[PDB]
């Protein structure tokens, strides 16, 4: 059970850890989050009480080091940093637990939600989408744009998602124009699965990471990427059966976890009505279809 201590909380902020979050008042004595479950990636994220713009946060994995939060008053945000002094850190953490200034990661034991949202997400793949290799953790915010968004400006601060584009030479073999555009199987299985992602789990991990960035930070380009990776599978007549059943599970927990109030900008009407009702895989997403219908019949 790992810990992420905070040096202080100088400004009023809503702190999130995974799908949980807490209100923290200006110069309230808050000094960390304990009992963070080992074995999964995590994200800790922030929204200042004064600037409901700019949600931001840090993807991390406690196996990869000892991380803490510190407020930087020059840059004006909560920063994740790594403590290299292993002893100096158990000291900070133990003394803060002793003074009981830390919140407990509040997992219900029956609850597999976080595992299901993060099954395929690996910190090593996250660090390739958010390139900043001096740090073992990854910063994401509301306004970061993707590499695709840019082609149509600062690269040090981009989300290097895999570019998917249905009207491109990559997507369309010469001679199979019509076939490859109506049935994307070629582009999914040879180009993307065997070619780029190598296997289905890295693909699901990018899909799942894009969703979580869209959900937690309202990152509009992540949402585009999430929908595109869905659409590619659903628009392919030939998908391994194991990918179809896993996808249904993946989407179900994503749709389940979405805030009810946000289903208007996070959910793309056309992609979903196509995937659930028109695509080759219309019949392969029973659990995802049933929860969409019962919870957002308006969008359909």
């Amino acid at each position: 059970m790992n810990t992420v201590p905070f040096t202080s909380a100088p400004i009023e902020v809503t702190i999130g850890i995974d799908q949980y979050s807490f209100n923290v008042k200006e110069n309230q004595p808050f000094h960390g989050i304990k009992d963070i479950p080992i074995g999964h990636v995590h994200v800790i994220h922030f929204q200042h009480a004064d600037n409901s713009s700019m949600r931001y946060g840090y993807w991390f994995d406690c196996r990869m080091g000892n991380f803490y939060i510190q407020y930087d008053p020059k840059d004006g945000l909560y920063k994740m940093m790594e403590e290299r002094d292993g002893a100096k850190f158990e000291n900070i953490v133990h003394n803060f637990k002793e003074r009981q200034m830390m919140v407990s990661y509040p997992k219900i034991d029956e609850d597999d939600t976080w595992y299901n949202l993060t099954e395929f997400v690996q910190m090593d793949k996250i660090r390739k989408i958010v390139r900043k290799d001096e740090n073992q953790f990854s910063y994401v915010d509301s306004s970061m744009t993707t590499v695709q968004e840019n082609e149509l400006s600062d690269p040090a601060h981009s989300l290097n998602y895999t570019v998917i584009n249905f009207k491109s030479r990559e997507a369309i073999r010469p001679g199979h124009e019509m076939e490859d555009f109506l049935d994307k199987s070629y582009y999914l299985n040879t180009v993307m699965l065997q070619g780029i992602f190598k296997n289905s789990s890295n693909y699901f991990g990018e899909l799942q990471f894009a969703f979580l960035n869209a959900m937690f930070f309202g990152n509009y380009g992540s949402s585009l990427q999430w929908h595109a990776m869905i659409e590619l599978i659903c628009s392919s007549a030939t998908v391994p059966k194991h990918m179809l059943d896993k996808l249904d599970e993946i989407l179900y927990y994503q749709i389940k976890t979405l805030p009810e109030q946000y289903s208007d900008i996070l959910l793309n009407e056309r992609v979903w009505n196509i995937c659930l009702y028109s695509s080759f895989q219309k019949n392969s997403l029973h659990n995802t279809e049933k929860i969409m219908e019962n919870k957002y019949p308006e969008l359909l």
């Binding site: 009207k167 491109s168 030479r169 369309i172 010469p174 124009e177 019509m178 555009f181």
Partner: protein
Amino acid sequence: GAMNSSNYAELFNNDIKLFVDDTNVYRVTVHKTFEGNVATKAINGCIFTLNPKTGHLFLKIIHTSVWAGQKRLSQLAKWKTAEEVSALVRSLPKEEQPKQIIVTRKAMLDPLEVHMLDFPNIAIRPTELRLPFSAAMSIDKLSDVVMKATEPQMVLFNIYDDWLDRISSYTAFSRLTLLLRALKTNEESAKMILLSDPTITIKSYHLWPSFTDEQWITIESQMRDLILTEYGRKYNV
């Protein structure tokens, strides 16, 4: 973006552009079978690819054989249209290739776009104009060449005959679309107007009669009258 009444004169500048109309690509008669079910029989069709500045028409004849053993033919027709337009572009010398292709039906954008991926600097554009190019098979010589074809064939025409010797592309194009609009609303009357007078002939290398300037004016007035009448009849205005 989309072509409309505003950016209308762009058709007549010196950027090479083509209109593509796919309406007559997949043509069927519908009939009853012995058992009394309905079946279609396909007849020869054509892609109508037109340079509106010069009058050059690239009439790609679509032989029924292309449909043999194929399903979802109306969808396929759009893709075969884009395949053929793409092959036409590739066949043209570079300085003859269009900078724009304007498709008369939006459903052609994706097929054409996908077929033109090798030509990223060619803009594919829809239009908001209601262009009468479906009536191209009401021009006797174009219908004749399509219906006699025994194989895929490209036939080249100037759809303006020799009009550009005397008038501008803009005026030529308005004459063409006026004629075609009349042939579309009431082909019988439209064709009567064009041929009522046995002394105005069609040259062997032309599509339309050899009207003098004054005769074209009387014709163009006769076509407008026809169009307006048919409209009051359609709507009871």
